Amino acid sequence: SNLVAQLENEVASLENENETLKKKNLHKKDLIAYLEKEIANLRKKIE
Amino acid sequence: GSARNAYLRKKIARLKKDNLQLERDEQNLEKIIANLRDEIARLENEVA
């Protein structure tokens, strides 16, 4: 009872940490698309 | 009603595995970023 309570806490703690780390990644993914659009338009210059 | 413990156990394990992957995903995304940033620095130097 007190045990299931802690276990369910743990599940929720881990979900939060992961959900944020997943967001930080999704953002690095937006960043990448950004640098790639940069390179594409830098290259359009010479070529 | 129980095997509730069992479900909680397995789910927690999956979540821990999920974190070790998100961690691997983060460092690789960082390696990809620094390389694109390096590539843009060369390009900017070539064009300039």
Please give the torsion angle defined by the CA atoms of residues A22, A25, A31 and A33, in that order, rounded to the nearest 10 degrees. Answer: -80
Domains of chain A (ranges plus CATH)? 1-47 (1.20.5.170)
**SS3 at position A47:** coil
Length in residues, chain A: 47
For residue A17, give the DSSP letter.
H
Method of structure determination = X-ray
User: For residue B3, what are its two tokens?
Assistant: 């095997």
Fold adopted by B1-48: 1.20.5
Instruction: Tell me, in Å, the resolution of the deposited structure.
Output: 1.8
Separation of alpha carbons B18 and B11, rounded Å: 10
In chain B, domain spans = 1-48
Mutate to test the interface with A, among B39, B42, B44, B45 (most CBs of A within 10 A): B39
